[PDB]
Structure 1
């Protein structure tokens, strides 16, 4: 009981480390969005859906970390 619960909680905190990837990744995408629109304003409608897609896929990796975090805390 003690040792198992404690491990679940240490694990849950550790599980949030991977989120740093999405934090950096989402930003890399929006940076490219911003620089690409600055260089070529007319391409805006083409690249904005590309940035939304990029962000969502990168964010999905953080979600998977958070899922493990929640499984440990609750499941």
Structure 2
């Protein structure tokens, strides 16, 4: 039983690694938003909702990691 609980806790720690992908990806999206608005200010209203969508989709990958992490923890 020591073994099973110990595996849940190590597994939960490992499950957070994938969050680095959303950390990096969210940033890549906002970088593009910023570069895009700087080069073409008039395009802001068009690309801002695209950036919000990109963020949410990238972020969803982190949510799934965290879901597995919490499932293992609790």
- What range describes the TM-score normalised by the shorter chain of this pair? over 0.9
After TM superposition, the score normalised by the length of structure 1 is 0.98
Residue 10 (structure 1) aligned with residue 10 (structure 2):
yes
How far did 1:62 drift?
A: 0.3
TM-score when scaled to structure 2? 1.00
Shift in Å, 1:71: 0.2
Find the aligned partners of 1:10 and 1:20 in 2 and give their Cα distance. 18
Provide the rounded CA distance (Å) in 2 between the counterparts of 1:14 and 1:24.
Answer: 18
Aligned length: 74
5+ residue gaps, structure 1, are none
SS at match of 1:17: coil
1:37 positional shift = 0.1
Q: CA RMSD in A?
A: 0.2
How far does residue 7 in structure 1 lie from its aligned partner after superposition? 0.2
**4+ runs of 1 displaced by more than 4 Å?**
none
